[PDB]
Amino acid sequence: HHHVTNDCPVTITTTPPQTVGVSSTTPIGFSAKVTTSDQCIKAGAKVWLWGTGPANKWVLQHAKVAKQKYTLNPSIDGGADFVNQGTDAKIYKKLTSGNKFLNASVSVNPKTQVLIPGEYTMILHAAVDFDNKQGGASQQTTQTIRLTVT
């Protein structure tokens, strides 16, 4: 029903960098949150979050060794959805004035997923879809989540 004349921002935050010991058994949480401007929410903006893995799953990737990685399936807030009823892990949410954030998280369980020392990064992509004067448009950005082991 509405279009904007300044493109919607895509505003993502993530968990700050974490450090853990190789022998820790505690679950490690990582989360991301996406929003946009109040005017874009009024206009009907839809925000997105996705990873770089198969089916847009989130990948915690060792800096040195290509094959060392964990592909993680996200959990999302109750107002968000997965693409195609969950056949893909890409996430979207139509924001509203009473519900302004898309929130999602993953977890590494050291008990089932072995912890190797070193640096890990996890790339997340976020976007916002809206209409401007030329019709459908989107802006996207990226942020990298970090984990240091031992």
Residue numbers in the entry: 7 to 156
Task: Paste lines from the article.
Different AAF variants are expressed by different EAEC strains, where they are required for the bacterium's adherence to small and large intestinal mucosa. As with Afa/Dr polyadhesins, AAF consist of two secreted protein subunits, a major subunit (A) and a putative minor subunit (B). In the fiber, subunits are linked together by donor strand complementation (DSC) with an N-terminal Gd donor strand segment of one subunit inserted into the hydrophobic cleft of a neighboring subunit. In this study, we report X-ray crystallographic and NMR studies of monomeric, donor-strand-complemented major and minor subunits of AAF/I from the German outbreak strain and AAF/II from EAEC strain 042 and provide an atomic resolution model for the structure of the entire fimbriae.
The DSC-monomers of the major subunits (AggAdsA and AafAdsA) have a classical Ig-like fold that consists of two β sheets packed against each other in a β sandwich. Instead, it has additional strands C and D, which form the edge of β sheet 2 (CDC1C2FGdA2) in this subunit. Both strand F and the donor strand (Gd) at the other edge of sheet 2 are longer in AggAdsA than in AafAdsA. The donor strand of AggAdsA inserts seven classical donor residues in to the acceptor cleft, which is two more than AafAdsA and other structurally characterized subunits from FGL CU systems. In addition, AggAdsA contains an α helix in the loop between B and C1 strands, which is absent in AafAdsA. These features give AggAdsA a more elongated shape than AafAdsA. To examine if fibronectin is a common receptor for AAF, we studied AggAdsA-fibronectin interactions using surface plasmon resonance (SPR). The experiment revealed specific binding with a dissociation constant of 16±2 µM. We focused the mutagenesis on surface patches comprising proximal pairs of lysines (including Lys51 and Lys109, Lys55 and Lys103, and Lys73 and Lys76) and the three closely positioned lysines Lys73, Lys76, and Lys78. All the double mutants exhibited significant decreases in fibronectin binding and, despite the absence of the cooperatively expected for a polymeric AggA fiber, the affinity for the triple mutant of monomeric AggAdsA dropped below the detection limit of the experiment. The pocket is particularly well pronounced in AAF/I. Three closely positioned lysines (73, 76 and 78), mutations of which practically abolished the binding, are located in the loop between the C2 and Ć strands at the bottom of the subunit.
